[PDB]
Amino acid sequence: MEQAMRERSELARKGIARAKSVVALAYAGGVLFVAENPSRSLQKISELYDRVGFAAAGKFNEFDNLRRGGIQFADTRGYAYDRRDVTGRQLANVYAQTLGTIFTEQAKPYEVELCVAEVAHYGETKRPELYRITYDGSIADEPHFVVMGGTTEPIANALKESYAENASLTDALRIAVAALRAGTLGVASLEVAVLDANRPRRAFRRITGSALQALLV
Amino acid sequence: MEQAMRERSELARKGIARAKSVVALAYAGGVLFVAENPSRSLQKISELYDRVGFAAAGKFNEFDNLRRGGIQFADTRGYAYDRRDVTGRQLANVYAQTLGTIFTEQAKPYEVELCVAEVAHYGETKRPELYRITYDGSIADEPHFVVMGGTTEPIANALKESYAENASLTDALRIAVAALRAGSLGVASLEVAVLDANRPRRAFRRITGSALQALLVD
Amino acid sequence: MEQAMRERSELARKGIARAKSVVALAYAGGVLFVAENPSRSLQKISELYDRVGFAAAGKFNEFDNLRRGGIQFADTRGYAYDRRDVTGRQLANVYAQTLGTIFTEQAKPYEVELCVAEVAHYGETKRPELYRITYDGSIADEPHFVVMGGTTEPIANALKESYAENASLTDALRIAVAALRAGLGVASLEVAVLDANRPRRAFRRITGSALQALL
Amino acid sequence: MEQAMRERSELARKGIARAKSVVALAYAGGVLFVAENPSRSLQKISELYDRVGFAAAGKFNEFDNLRRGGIQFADTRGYAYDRRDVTGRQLANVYAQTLGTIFTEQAKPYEVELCVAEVAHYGETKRPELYRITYDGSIADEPHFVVMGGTTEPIANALKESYAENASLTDALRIAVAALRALGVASLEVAVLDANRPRRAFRRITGSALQALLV
Amino acid sequence: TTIVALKYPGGVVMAGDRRSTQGNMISGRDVRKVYITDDYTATGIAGTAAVAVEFARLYAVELEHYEKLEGVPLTFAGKINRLAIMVRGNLAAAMQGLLALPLLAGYDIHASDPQSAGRIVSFDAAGGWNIEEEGYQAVGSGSLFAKSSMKKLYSQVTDGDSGLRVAVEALYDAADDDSATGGPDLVRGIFPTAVIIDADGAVDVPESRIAELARAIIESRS
Amino acid sequence: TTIVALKYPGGVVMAGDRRSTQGNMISGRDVRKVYITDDYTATGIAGTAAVAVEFARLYAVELEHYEKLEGVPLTFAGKINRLAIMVRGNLAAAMQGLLALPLLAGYDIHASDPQSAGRIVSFDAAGGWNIEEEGYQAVGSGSLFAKSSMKKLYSQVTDGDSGLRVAVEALYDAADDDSATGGPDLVRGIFPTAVIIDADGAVDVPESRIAELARAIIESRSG
Amino acid sequence: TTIVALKYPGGVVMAGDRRSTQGNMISGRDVRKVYITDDYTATGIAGTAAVAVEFARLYAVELEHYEKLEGVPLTFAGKINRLAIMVRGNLAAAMQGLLALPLLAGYDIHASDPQSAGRIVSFDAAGGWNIEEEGYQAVGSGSLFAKSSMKKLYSQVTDGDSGLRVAVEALYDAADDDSATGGPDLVRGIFPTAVIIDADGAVDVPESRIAELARAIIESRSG
Amino acid sequence: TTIVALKYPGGVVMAGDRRSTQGNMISGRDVRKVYITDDYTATGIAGTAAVAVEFARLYAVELEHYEKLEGVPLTFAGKINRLAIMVRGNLAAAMQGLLALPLLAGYDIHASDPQSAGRIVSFDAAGGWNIEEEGYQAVGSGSLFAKSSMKKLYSQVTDGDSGLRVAVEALYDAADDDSATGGPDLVRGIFPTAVIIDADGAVDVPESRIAELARAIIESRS
Numbered sequence A: 001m002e003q004a005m006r007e008r009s010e011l012a013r014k015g016i017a018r019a020k021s022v023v024a025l026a027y028a029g030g031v032l033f034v035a036e037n038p039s040r041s042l043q044k045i046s047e048l049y050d051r052v053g054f055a056a057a058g059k060f061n062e063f064d065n066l067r068r069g070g071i072q073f074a075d076t077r078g079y080a081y082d083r084r085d086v087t088g089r090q091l092a093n094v095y096a097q098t099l100g101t102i103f104t105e106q107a108k109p110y111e112v113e114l115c116v117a118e119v120a121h122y123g124e125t126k127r128p129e130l131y132r133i134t135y136d137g138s139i140a141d142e143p144h145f146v147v148m149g150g151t152t153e154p155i156a157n158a159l160k161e162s163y164a165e166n167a168s169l170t171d172a173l174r175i176a177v178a179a180l181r182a183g184t185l186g187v188a189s190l191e192v193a194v195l196d197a198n199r200p201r202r203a204f205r206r207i208t209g210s211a212l213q214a215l216l217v
Numbered sequence B: 001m002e003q004a005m006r007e008r009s010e011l012a013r014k015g016i017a018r019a020k021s022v023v024a025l026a027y028a029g030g031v032l033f034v035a036e037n038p039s040r041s042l043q044k045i046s047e048l049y050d051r052v053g054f055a056a057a058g059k060f061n062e063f064d065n066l067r068r069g070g071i072q073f074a075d076t077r078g079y080a081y082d083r084r085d086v087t088g089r090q091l092a093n094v095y096a097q098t099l100g101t102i103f104t105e106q107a108k109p110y111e112v113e114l115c116v117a118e119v120a121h122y123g124e125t126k127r128p129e130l131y132r133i134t135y136d137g138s139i140a141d142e143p144h145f146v147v148m149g150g151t152t153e154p155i156a157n158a159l160k161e162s163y164a165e166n167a168s169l170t171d172a173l174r175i176a177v178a179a180l181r182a183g184s185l186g187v188a189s190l191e192v193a194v195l196d197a198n199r200p201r202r203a204f205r206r207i208t209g210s211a212l213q214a215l216l217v218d
Numbered sequence C: 001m002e003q004a005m006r007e008r009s010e011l012a013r014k015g016i017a018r019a020k021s022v023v024a025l026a027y028a029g030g031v032l033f034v035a036e037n038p039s040r041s042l043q044k045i046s047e048l049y050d051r052v053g054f055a056a057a058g059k060f061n062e063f064d065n066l067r068r069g070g071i072q073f074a075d076t077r078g079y080a081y082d083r084r085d086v087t088g089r090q091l092a093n094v095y096a097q098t099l100g101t102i103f104t105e106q107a108k109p110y111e112v113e114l115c116v117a118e119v120a121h122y123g124e125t126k127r128p129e130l131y132r133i134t135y136d137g138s139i140a141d142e143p144h145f146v147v148m149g150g151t152t153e154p155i156a157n158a159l160k161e162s163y164a165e166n167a168s169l170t171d172a173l174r175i176a177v178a179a180l181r182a183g184l185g186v187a188s189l190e191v192a193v194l195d196a197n198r199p200r201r202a203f204r205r206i207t208g209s210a211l212q213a214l215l
Numbered sequence D: 001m002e003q004a005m006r007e008r009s010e011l012a013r014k015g016i017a018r019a020k021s022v023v024a025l026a027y028a029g030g031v032l033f034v035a036e037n038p039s040r041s042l043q044k045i046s047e048l049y050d051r052v053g054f055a056a057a058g059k060f061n062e063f064d065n066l067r068r069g070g071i072q073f074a075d076t077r078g079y080a081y082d083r084r085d086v087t088g089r090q091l092a093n094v095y096a097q098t099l100g101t102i103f104t105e106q107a108k109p110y111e112v113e114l115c116v117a118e119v120a121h122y123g124e125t126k127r128p129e130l131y132r133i134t135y136d137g138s139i140a141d142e143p144h145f146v147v148m149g150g151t152t153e154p155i156a157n158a159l160k161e162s163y164a165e166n167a168s169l170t171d172a173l174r175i176a177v178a179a180l181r182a183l184g185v186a187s188l189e190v191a192v193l194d195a196n197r198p199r200r201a202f203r204r205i206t207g208s209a210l211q212a213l214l215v
Numbered sequence E, H: 001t002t003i004v005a006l007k008y009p010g011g012v013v014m015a016g017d018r019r020s021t022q023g024n025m026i027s028g029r030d031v032r033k034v035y036i037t038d039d040y041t042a043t044g045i046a047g048t049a050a051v052a053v054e055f056a057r058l059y060a061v062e063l064e065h066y067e068k069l070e071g072v073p074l075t076f077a078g079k080i081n082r083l084a085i086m087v088r089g090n091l092a093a094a095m096q097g098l099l100a101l102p103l104l105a106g107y108d109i110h111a112s113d114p115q116s117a118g119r120i121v122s123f124d125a126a127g128g129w130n131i132e133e134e135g136y137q138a139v140g141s142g143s144l145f146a147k148s149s150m151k152k153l154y155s156q157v158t159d160g161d162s163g164l165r166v167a168v169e170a171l172y173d174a175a176d177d178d179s180a181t182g183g184p185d186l187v188r189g190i191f192p193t194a195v196i197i198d199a200d201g202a203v204d205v206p207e208s209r210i211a212e213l214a215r216a217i218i219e220s221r222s
Numbered sequence F, G: 001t002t003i004v005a006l007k008y009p010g011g012v013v014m015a016g017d018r019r020s021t022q023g024n025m026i027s028g029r030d031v032r033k034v035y036i037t038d039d040y041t042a043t044g045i046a047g048t049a050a051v052a053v054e055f056a057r058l059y060a061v062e063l064e065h066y067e068k069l070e071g072v073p074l075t076f077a078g079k080i081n082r083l084a085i086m087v088r089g090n091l092a093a094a095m096q097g098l099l100a101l102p103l104l105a106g107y108d109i110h111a112s113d114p115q116s117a118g119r120i121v122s123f124d125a126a127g128g129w130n131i132e133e134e135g136y137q138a139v140g141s142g143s144l145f146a147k148s149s150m151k152k153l154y155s156q157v158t159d160g161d162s163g164l165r166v167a168v169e170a171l172y173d174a175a176d177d178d179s180a181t182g183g184p185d186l187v188r189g190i191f192p193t194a195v196i197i198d199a200d201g202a203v204d205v206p207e208s209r210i211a212e213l214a215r216a217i218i219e220s221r222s223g
């Protein structure tokens, strides 16, 4: 029993440790996702729902399976009730249940770490919410930032000394890429997006290409 | 768990290492597929959809199951939505999920490596896209070429120092055949095909017989 | 995993290596099947479809299973499309898939080796096709002959030395019986032919005094 | 994999080794089944169909399940087609398939050995056919006799030394009993596939009549 | 039946008659057709008594089920969608006589203005719904009479009290012209039930108040 | 439609017309209704064209399927029973207008006397069959005409040429009295299809032989 | 009901009336029948209020579902096929009185010429669709009147604002001849709803603009 | 609707009208009823517009599906079998009004004689089929008119140009007697669609060529 679960835990951890790292932090305009991703078309950050965003680390097919399941959950609940009943807390909760089931019952555990974020609805005053779901269904409520994958202690500490609330978009971005480096890196090796509390309905936005370049400098 | 996934990984990897080699290559007119293959009718390169092609290394019946599954998926999406909604990205994504599941839950993992390629729709300007999907669901977006099966380091090196994005069909073909030899060769031992971005609708086209001979010689 | 597949592979290979041998070779008239076979009623060679024939080596109940499954496939596809859509390539393809599944998932792997052959339709020019499918679903395209069962090496070499394209029925038959011996009269032989000169059903058995006359 | 299959093989092999023995042989009047059977009411020899008879050695409940499944097969096929389409080779073939499936898949392999025999239809001239299906689905086509169960080699030897084609009923019976000792009416189950009866060839030879024959 | 609902400054009121019939025969005098379905919501239901009550019961259990599972109550929009889905699910039965046709009155705690946050939602037997912008609405065999009354009396609604008065007098006119709607029964002491909902939640209106208003309308007419 | 079948010494012959209709309208002129179902048997079917043809194709596949699976062809009795089972299976559809009423002719290689090995089997829509002992049979909308014709002409049947003559003439009478059965079309060259079966197997009668017999019948009846 | 759509240079407009009935009885004065279903498409459905709304909502959800799952929206063709599939799915209910008949207006961000990137797609109850090439379309009980009116007025459409006036006018005529289509209600201040779509996306038309167009139409047709 | 198909020396031509109705009301002027279903095959379908188009789309997808799965296209006999099966599969819905009656035209790359490799196959609603041997066929509400026209005009079919002209003229005669088949529209410039197949494949006939043919026919009849 306990040996099986220690093995599953280790296989998973070693999976996530060997993955490229990801950071999502609260900033003045909402929440920022910055991910080490050289791919041209395969994405690790994603929209879940109107004000709810998603980012993961680990094995791509597994956390993409989870992203898709989450979009299914969100759209279904929004339809059967109302759009405004879909919340980040809910999706973190279902991811917790889903990953716990996966971790105890599936042939192999998912080598995955997940971050669900929510910003306020348009015109409302509400602190952004970050949640981290680890491979075994553990769920953590985080106030300022979330760090996932690779070697996290360096990046988390970098942020812990450089993170300041109400940061602007460029400041927050540079703090995030700086923390990532502690673990040369520009448009071609980054996937960036934001939950932008200023947009009226769909808050998820990718910042790519000329825009991202402009913001890095 | 650890030993099980350990020797699953070893069994797939070594199955693929003993299989003939295959090369997919961006060239001036689209994508070129060249596979070491002695059969006249048994195929490891195949059309998937209008502008999307497929190549595989490893155990034939397994990558053929996968090829058939992919044709099923593409024809189904195209009919459910419109043909223009089928992309190489989608097929690669579905292959990574499928092969991940196979790898963790099937009696034997599949001894296969897959390449999905896509070229521009007719009249459009879009650099080809090449995707590699390995036995465990890992997926990699690649810029110029993909090498699968057998001993890949030599062939990748030959292409890295020989590759030309703007080569002609003939040039790209002899580059690919050269690299395949450097990984160890005529019409009777090759399967060649192309995703031709110049065709109006279906870009997939095989290059057989005296035509393939013409491309090899002079 | 590695343990299991090693065991399954060796069980299959030992089974087949203990079984009697079978040869199929292309000759001027079509395809010739010759199998060492002492039974008078139990058969190792079979018709599949109009121009497609089947030969198997190993455990009878298992390759008879796969023979019935092939006939099911052939007839069902021919009814669903047209008779001419059925090919040896696709029968061989589905046997590849089937033995692959069997080999990895049945309680015991099948101890069988399979050959599927096609000849041209009446009045057309098409080199015969020969396919060899082994117990793990591996499939091979062969131009001249296919050897299955028992010690395949002596027979394969004998055929490599003695095989000539477009032999006579008599000469192909002699070459075959001779390569077989390297690892035999009427009463110990089952012989059949895919006869490209038959109008629709090419499969024909050469039995009794007719076989004797060519021996 | 090879472990399981070895243990299965020798479990069934030893089971059959311990069982009483059964012989079946072709004679001038059809086919004769003679088995050692102390019971007065439990049968090891059975009619399957018009001209098709069944005999078995080993564990009773298992070869009785197979006997019943065979009758089911014959009555279903004769009904689904015509009576005349049911052959001994058809029953022997499906017994092969079944015993193979049992052998690889059942919780315990069956400890049985089966003989299926067929005599000519009334008024025809057809050599009796004898089939022997072993515990692993292996099947064999026999021209003169089959021995099953217990120590088969003494009996096989006796018959190979004492067997004569077209023997009379009383003689074949004598030789058969003799081979079995290598045994009176109360210890013998004896039946015949009588090729001179119009429809159903199977008839037991029991009690007084059996004694008159043994005398 | 007549169920009525109307918006007044800072709240909403809903009121329903007490009559049950089978054809022409009076089978009940004291049935309740208006239910507090949660702290900020009442549903009045016309149709088959059993299906109506079943709807109210199920609906309240459903809204609270969500609230306990998710830690927060459904938005008003979601509450509407769940009632509407219930009605649509019953259409097949409703065509065979088992009809539940609801009317929703709520107070939206999330709305901007705590004086216009009152909500009245009408439904049709397919589950179609509409949020009533003109201040009042009614359902049931007497709903036309009730609506044509409130059309004239609605200018008198200035607070909870006058709104309840107009609601009970609408129910009165309904009873005057529809025999399937019960009027105030002064002999037995049975009167329409009513709920009023404001920022402080939904509350049952004391019978004695409705009786007072009924006696005042009755006296007024004679 | 009219399909006819009849025995002649040492074999059997089956012929069928070529017409396809939708009410009064002629929708087809060259349809084929008589089919070599295997080396020794032909089935001809009347009713709805799609279901008729479907039956013929599936029944042929079934016989050859048994023969390949078992190494031996079904007995003639088994062939009958399989056709009857198919027919019974179609009954509900047949009552809703998807009708298939067949007629079977063949040569029984396992019969006693090659002198009387020809077989004519008729069916009804519930799947009942009967092995005709009086030498001829017909099915389809023109069947009673063709059978009364053959009732007068059968004594003229002494070999396969006479048998094929009598069957073409039966079809001719049938088309003469039943507008849903087509007669010979001399303008277009379309004549009934015919199978003749003996110990050497079932073979198609070339169109030109039917043409010749047609012209003989016409000229016989005009003068 | 009357819903109209038409193409103007560079864009499309769609407008719908506000009326809900049960038989003769007016059960709604402010219902919304035209909906922005994605950033570049609007859908307007006639039929049973409940099914029509449910369609608009579920369709928007399906389009955004695809966009989130695959990182890119459906092609316009795909969007059409999904609406058609929904309608076909509802057919049996619609033949029992739960009808939803949509009219689709859109701007194709992948069309060749942006000035004619406008798209107007009409549907029938079976899910058959046609992309309208003569520039306008209408659905609902008043769509005949609206379409004849537009046949006469379309030549005046030279831009978005004249397209909006023509759409409002078509709805006016419709309400003039069809009691199940509501006209502008000047006492209550309720007017048709309008969506307009160009390269910058789909935007709701403010009620005041529709009100001005309506009052102009009314004064025009008066003294 | 009217769809026509005819063989000409070395190929085949199919053409269809453009009209869509609902009873007497004209609901479509430019609908397409003839579809290149693969490199050597076109199918035209009469009946319920939605069902006809669905049949063409799914049919071509089925043929290409087989091609990419097996590496080789279905024989012509196999394409016929598959279309037939689709129709028989739809019989139940067809009885209730979702009808789809196809006409198949093709060029058999495996036929013996290239000059007679053209194929025309007609179908009935039960899935029965027939390979036409007399040169021409038609389908839809106007097909009797079109076939009776072609019967007179077919002797003039000596090449693809004559074949195309005779086809368009049959569509013209149909539209002249069947209000559910649309004639050439000169005001709008809408003309029948047409596809021609020979050894080089199946190709769409440009609208302007159909227009020239149309005017020549009208002229010739005035």
Ligand SMILES: Cc1cc(C(=O)N[C@@H](CC(=O)N2CCCC[C@@H]2C)C(=O)N[C@@H](C)C(=O)NCc2ccc(F)cc2F)no1
Binding pocket: E001, E019, E020, E021, E022, E023, E027, E028, E031, E032, E033, E034, E045, E046, E047, E048, E049, E050, E052, E053, E097
């Ligand atoms: C299929 C069927 C219908 C009926 C029926 O007509 N049932 C009557 C109700 C009735 O006779 N009853 C007395 C005993 C039990 C309880 C109840 C009170 C009804 O439903 N009549 C309809 C016309 C009606 O009056 N509906 C009013 C109403 C609305 C909402 C509500 F909650 C309660 C109500 F009574 N019975 O079976």
Ligand SMILES: Cc1cc(C(=O)N[C@@H](CC(=O)N2CCCC[C@@H]2C)C(=O)N[C@@H](C)C(=O)NCc2ccc(F)cc2F)no1
Binding pocket: F001, F019, F020, F021, F022, F027, F028, F031, F032, F033, F045, F046, F047, F048, F049, F050, F052, F053, H091, H122, H123, H124, H125, H126, H127, H128, H129, H130
């Ligand atoms: C459900 C349905 C039935 C029909 C229908 O009546 N279909 C006609 C046949 C017809 O119009 N067709 C032309 C296009 C296709 C092929 C075929 C030839 C039929 O079935 N008619 C019956 C009454 C008939 O004539 N049957 C004769 C017949 C018998 C056996 C056979 F094999 C073929 C035949 F045509 N249509 O839809």
Ligand SMILES: Cc1cc(C(=O)N[C@@H](CC(=O)N2CCCC[C@@H]2C)C(=O)N[C@@H](C)C(=O)NCc2ccc(F)cc2F)no1
Binding pocket: E122, E123, E124, E125, E126, E128, E129, E130, G001, G019, G020, G021, G022, G023, G027, G028, G031, G032, G033, G045, G046, G047, G048, G049, G050, G052, G053, G097
């Ligand atoms: C089975 C059934 C049908 C009906 C019915 O007639 N339902 C009416 C709608 C109605 O009475 N209502 C008021 C309260 C509820 C919601 C809505 C506002 C309808 O559907 N009438 C048709 C004739 C109609 O008016 N349709 C207009 C329309 C079109 C699109 C849209 F989105 C909304 C609409 F109201 N009731 O039960």
Ligand SMILES: Cc1cc(C(=O)N[C@@H](CC(=O)N2CCCC[C@@H]2C)C(=O)N[C@@H](C)C(=O)NCc2ccc(F)cc2F)no1
Binding pocket: G122, G123, G124, G125, G126, G128, G129, G130, H001, H019, H020, H021, H022, H023, H027, H028, H031, H032, H033, H045, H046, H047, H048, H049, H050, H052, H053
């Ligand atoms: C259950 C049902 C049937 C109908 C109906 O009659 N639908 C009409 C089609 C129609 O009104 N439409 C305009 C808007 C949408 C698309 C289409 C173009 C039809 O099917 N009519 C039949 C009689 C017809 O005219 N069919 C011609 C036709 C044939 C083949 C083809 F591919 C397309 C066609 F329009 N509506 O609901």
